[PDB]
């Protein structure tokens with residue numbers, strides 16, 4: 001296991017997120033169910049080739065990392081929320097997760113280093 005991984009993500013918040021507000025939307029109103037449907041739709045379009053992960057993240061991620069095309073940079077264990085960390089360190093470079101749930105919302109993660 002490396003000391004640190006670098007990842008990009010796409011976050012979809014919902015109305016029960018810890019902070020239901022984002023750079024792109026003043027109040028998050030979507031339900032948890034709707035957030036997961038959006039995440040699963042993005043996964044399916046990335047798999048078919050219809051959409052590019054980094055483009056989708058720039059446009060639609062509720063994390064301010066959207067401006068960096070979803071890049072979070074490098075991190076070790078003990079920093080991020082545990083489910084995010086566990087998913088990230090389980091990926092190979094170039095691999096993308098399924099849905100990952102944290103107190104922030106629902107994530108897709110792409111490990112880049």
Ligand SMILES: CC1=C(/C=C/C(C)=C/C=C/C(C)=C/C(=O)O)C(C)(C)CCC1
Pocket residue numbers: 011018019020021022023062063064079080081084085102104
């Ligand atoms: C995603 C994420 C985390 C926190 C996410 C949240 C809460 C992001 C906030 C974005 C906005 C946009 C907040 C706001 O506007 O209040 C940490 C690093 C702890 C664990 C995994 C990565």
